[PDB]
Amino acid sequence: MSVGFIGAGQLAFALAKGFTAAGVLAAHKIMASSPDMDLATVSALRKMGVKLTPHNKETVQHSDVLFLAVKPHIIPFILDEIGADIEDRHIVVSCAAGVTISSIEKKLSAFRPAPRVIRCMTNTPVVVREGATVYATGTHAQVEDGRLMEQLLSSVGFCTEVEEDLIDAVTGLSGSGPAYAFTALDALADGGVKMGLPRRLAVRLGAQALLGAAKMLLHSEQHPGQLKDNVSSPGGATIHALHVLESGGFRSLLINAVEASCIRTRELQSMADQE
Amino acid sequence: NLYFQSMSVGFIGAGQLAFALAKGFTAAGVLAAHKIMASSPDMDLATVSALRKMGVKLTPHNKETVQHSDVLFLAVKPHIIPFILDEIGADIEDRHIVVSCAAGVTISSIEKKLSAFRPAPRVIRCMTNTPVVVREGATVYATGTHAQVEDGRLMEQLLSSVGFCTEVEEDLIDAVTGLSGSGPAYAFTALDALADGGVKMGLPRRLAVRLGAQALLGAAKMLLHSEQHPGQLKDNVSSPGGATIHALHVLESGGFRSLLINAVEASCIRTRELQSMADQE
Amino acid sequence: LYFQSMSVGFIGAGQLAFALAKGFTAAGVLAAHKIMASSPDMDLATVSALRKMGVKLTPHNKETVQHSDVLFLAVKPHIIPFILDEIGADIEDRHIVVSCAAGVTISSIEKKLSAFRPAPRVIRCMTNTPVVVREGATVYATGTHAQVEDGRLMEQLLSSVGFCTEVEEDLIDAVTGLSGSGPAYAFTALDALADGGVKMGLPRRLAVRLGAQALLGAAKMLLHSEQHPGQLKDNVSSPGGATIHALHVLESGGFRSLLINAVEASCIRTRELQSMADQE
Amino acid sequence: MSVGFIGAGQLAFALAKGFTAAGVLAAHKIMASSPDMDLATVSALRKMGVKLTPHNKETVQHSDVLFLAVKPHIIPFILDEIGADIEDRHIVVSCAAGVTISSIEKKLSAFRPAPRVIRCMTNTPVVVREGATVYATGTHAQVEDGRLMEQLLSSVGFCTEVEEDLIDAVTGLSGSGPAYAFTALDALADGGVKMGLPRRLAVRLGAQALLGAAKMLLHSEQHPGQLKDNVSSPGGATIHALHVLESGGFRSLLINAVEASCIRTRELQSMADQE
Amino acid sequence: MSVGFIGAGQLAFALAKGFTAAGVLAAHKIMASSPDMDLATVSALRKMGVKLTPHNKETVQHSDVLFLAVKPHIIPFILDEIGADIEDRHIVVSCAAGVTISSIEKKLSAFRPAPRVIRCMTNTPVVVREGATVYATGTHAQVEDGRLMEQLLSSVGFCTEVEEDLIDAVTGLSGSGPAYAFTALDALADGGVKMGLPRRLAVRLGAQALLGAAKMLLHSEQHPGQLKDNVSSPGGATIHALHVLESGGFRSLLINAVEASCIRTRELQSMADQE
């Protein structure tokens, strides 16, 4: 099976890294393309054995499954450029935030009737095979196409099919989510350092606690509030810390965040659609 | 692996921590369940029924656990430790490794109590967390005055089977308690609230819970395997003008970073305060 | 359930004495005429109420102690010392003394009473006014000399007007902050919620009724469910819906921390008051 | 009398469980329909004894009283599905938040001329027979229809007739109301645990306190301020706790919540009334 | 001239880097010592040509000027260990935060009368020869000693003699100062990225603006408020941004910071002195 990436940045490197680390794709059967063939993501991809090229045309003619891995606003430019080269064998998987199946199918249908389009939202932890991924199938996506997508992306993390009208919300939760965790971990490390731990130890312990707590949840039947109960003993240290999180409106900040990321994703797509 | 060949473990107290550690210990295969004994006064309890299903030997007699164990974990609340040490103290023999898990409780307080019986108790203090139950714990430990060199080697091997383990000087353990001991509760509050956000934006609760937990899992895993500063990694995720940099701004406008600093601090300070009040009495 | 030869007496004839007596008679386990209350303000509003029930009223605490087998101390906490000095020589071996006072410890009660006769039988309880509708939340702790049959009797009596359970005494100040003061948080919340309903177009009477019915049913759901309150809150909030929007404005205000602050302030104040009674 | 539910989720389970606990209705005189059968609520209603079917038409033909228990945006889809199947004998009770009698009649009136519609607002504590219900009768609902609906819903809690223009306000007060109570109970338990109580005992005592206070109010002639006065003695623990609530603006948060819920209810019906 | 560093961490590397970059000391005439002879600061120092060693004894016997570059609490341990090796040729320059001349002279005078002690406060930008440095001379510091110190440290940044009772305040301002600037620069970069700049460009421009504004001030006669006036035109963009800094209490946060750093430095030295 032949894979290609339009655009070779953070997202394309993470995906090729996980795919090849999962063992489901050889690196030499993967090609990516970028105009700036001297990006540091281009270097990492070439060290990894991926075929690199500046011409978007060679990538499409190489691959069956084609990931669009450029920024949202470049997508119209990308699609006008390769639209004429989309054979019937292709599955076009769009990764860009907010870009709708409708808009991709409209641009590509001007060239070939019935382009096969899958929209996915992912995140950078696919690079360690722990990404969170949802996808939606376009009008002309065959049933097997959605099964190939799910098999492929389940090798690098969690995957499930969703209705397209959830994906902007997913983008704000698990698309932006790693950036919230990274911010939280830097602060928790700061807390550790304040109380006397060396930086390196504080980072390791915070990340390890974040990891174990999430895994606990994923493997537990129970509610996040219930697992929290089990950690905090009456009068003890944890319940005291939880009180200071509550007094600052900790929960509402996280809600504000997911909301802000989602709304901004919708807002960007209105300006894309208006234009 | 001969460290675990004939080794017997006991837990004084059979609650959340005993079950988490026994659950990870048995799931790791380092110990068979029947080689483990847990004791508690309220036998018919929530966690003591899980431990019996695993195959752990249970008993209401703290002394039976002492007679059974090579390594004896103290899995009771901190204020019970002196009450427990007075009880089984005359039973701790030279062959024992006493491992205190209680938050705050110093190696000094345990050694002072136990040395009024046999002169050289081998005491190790640890701080761990519940994710050892899925073998992803965060554990540190400090060896006491009489803890032999191999004693720390065995303790590290035992607790590394259920997660990260490293030795520390004792005076850090209270700050570790505020960071990784209380850590999981911070993550569960965060995950609950991310899901509320997901739900507010139109996601089913089940999907929002799965997705936020997977997102925290993957991000923490990325950090542990990366050679790079948590700031660089967030820089990689936020593209110019994008959804993510917008969401990071509302986190900054609420003082998100400082709330987690307050939290680690409040936990560490409460841990010290509880131990200074126990030291008074 | 009816304990024939059980005479009950109340020192103090106010809010709590009225609430306990109304619950006890409504439950039918005590006829009103086998109950006696005493107060110096025989022209109080709750004294009027208890006499309409048929409860035997009297101004003399000695008359209450001599009538009673179980004796409720339902006076302000600073009054408990003076009361125990007035009646302590009238205490007999047959009495079970139940103190209702916030924060006043069993130790303090026994030290005062044992100056008069050894081995007084003391139980400390924390309750709340909803016993008046038989939905109280009560805990109790037995003293040094209470017989095991005394706590079982107190528990039987008090279970008939709400939830009742034995606790260790050192939990009672925190229970005071949770369920003793707790009805007052509910009343403040129901007044506010009704205000919200009036703001959005509801008549005041309707808003009060619906608000109270919603708190009552949610509480009943939790008591009869196995599940976490968070889990029941997940069940009521649908994606993007009206409820998750409201929960967000609650979270932005630190709603949860305010109720932790409240329980904490009530408990600390309770300890503080006793800790300076112990100084006097 | 036969009862049907279009949509077999949280509300249908709550009403079915309450009606049969009340004994007004035999489980097997209840029928519910849902496309997504693998739902948790379908498994719960099955064991109750309710008849389950994927076809909304079978529910309509079974029912004398037909509850509309789908998400508010599904309502227009549903009324077009079974509109031809509504007969003269039906009483159509809409349980959807925000959806007006006007919009329901307009859809249904295109088929049979005189649809008997009732709008109701309820909440999940019907499942323990302590719900709070209001209802408005539509244009063709006869006097006997309102009486029958009142009788049915009074068996699972409080029920009264309102003008329809109140029901959006009711939704924010008593419809969303249980969720405010669950948040408060969880936080009240956290405070109990902070001060030394076991979680189980603190959950139990907080819920019992809210239950007794609410019942006290419902059985009282008195303003909630007066009851509050009765609990707080001079200098005492309660009046100190009420000060820290007042200092956080506790009352305004609850007003904010009711208002935010009511606004959202109106906003969604504006979106429906445009689409 | 012979220099030695007790402790080879961030501070010792920065100083040796600037000194050798200034051209006033050859790297091979510099020796440092550390127990953890495998620190990454140890590696940088060895790549640089400094003599490394684990024994604190060899450093003292190598150097004339001896910097104490360990953490404050290690200083008593350090001084008890080498006190007996302090010849009369040595100048002991203590860099540790908060540690007083008094306490160093007391420990060292137990071995040799009249130890020559200079207390300095510095910061990490000495590594690019732009540090801010103050020093105070001890009781037995000869006049030339203070002149050797000032000449040495003026080659790697600003230097001036102060009374010792200012140094804790200096520690909070220019000792901790670089950490405030680094925090500010990360946030300004975030602001740039929010408004559409690539990360790399936003960091470069912020740092360049921070640098030019400081240099402007250092070379200007005028008051920081006056230079601010000259930047903001009536109604323009700058004065708008300055208003949002004022509304959040920007200035007071910076005052809080310097204060917090200073008080904590005093507080640590009381516990050192008490112990």
Ligand SMILES: NC(=O)C1=CN([C@@H]2O[C@H](COP(=O)(O)OP(=O)(O)OC[C@H]3O[C@@H](n4cnc5c(N)ncnc54)[C@H](O)[C@@H]3O)[C@@H](O)[C@H]2O)C=CC1
């Ligand atoms: N970084 C993240 O956290 C994730 C990013 N995404 C999405 O993936 C897309 C890119 O993500 P990043 O990898 O952060 O982008 P990036 O900014 O790292 O680099 C994107 C690549 O596209 C290349 N490119 C630009 N114009 C091109 C053209 N005309 N033809 C071919 N290649 C071109 C750029 O040179 C660069 O190599 C965005 O739409 C983003 O929403 C989604 C999931 C996670």
Ligand SMILES: NC(=O)C1=CN([C@@H]2O[C@H](COP(=O)(O)OP(=O)(O)OC[C@H]3O[C@@H](n4cnc5c(N)ncnc54)[C@H](O)[C@@H]3O)[C@@H](O)[C@H]2O)C=CC1
């Ligand atoms: N749960 C957590 O998240 C962690 C807890 N810890 C520490 O572990 C200890 C207990 O942790 P949890 O298990 O959370 O408490 P827990 O209360 O779930 O278990 C306590 C156990 O001690 C038993 N116990 C009480 N008195 C006893 C006695 N006299 N003899 C024997 N057993 C007795 C209780 O019956 C109960 O089984 C505490 O000191 C806590 O600080 C430390 C790390 C993680």
Ligand SMILES: NC(=O)C1=CN([C@@H]2O[C@H](COP(=O)(O)OP(=O)(O)OC[C@H]3O[C@@H](n4cnc5c(N)ncnc54)[C@H](O)[C@@H]3O)[C@@H](O)[C@H]2O)C=CC1
């Ligand atoms: N009111 C409440 O919500 C609850 C009350 N309590 C406790 O119950 C006790 C009383 O509470 P309330 O009944 O609300 O007080 P209250 O002030 O309504 O009535 C107190 C009674 O004590 C009587 N009294 C004063 N001096 C007396 C004396 N020397 N001899 C006999 N009677 C005397 C007064 O006349 C008054 O009738 C307090 O200790 C309080 O902590 C505990 C739980 C809830």
Ligand SMILES: NC(=O)C1=CN([C@@H]2O[C@H](COP(=O)(O)OP(=O)(O)OC[C@H]3O[C@@H](n4cnc5c(N)ncnc54)[C@H](O)[C@@H]3O)[C@@H](O)[C@H]2O)C=CC1
């Ligand atoms: N959950 C609550 O707390 C309360 C809910 N409500 C209202 O009740 C309605 C539903 O409430 P929930 O039951 O919580 O929603 P829910 O999502 O639990 O159940 C919705 C049901 O509709 C079914 N459904 C979806 N499309 C359908 C279709 N085309 N034909 C037939 N059935 C279909 C789904 O399978 C699901 O079972 C909403 O409009 C809400 O406003 C009002 C009072 C309280």
Ligand SMILES: NC(=O)C1=CN([C@@H]2O[C@H](COP(=O)(O)OP(=O)(O)OC[C@H]3O[C@@H](n4cnc5c(N)ncnc54)[C@H](O)[C@@H]3O)[C@@H](O)[C@H]2O)C=CC1
């Ligand atoms: N990093 C900064 O921003 C500045 C630090 N300082 C001061 O300089 C001192 C250290 O600063 P950092 O370089 O941040 O320390 P650091 O933590 O980078 O490393 C200090 C060095 O001391 C070594 N060391 C520990 N015990 C030792 C011993 N017994 N004998 C010899 N070496 C030993 C450590 O192994 C490490 O190499 C502190 O007192 C600090 O206040 C002052 C100016 C700026």
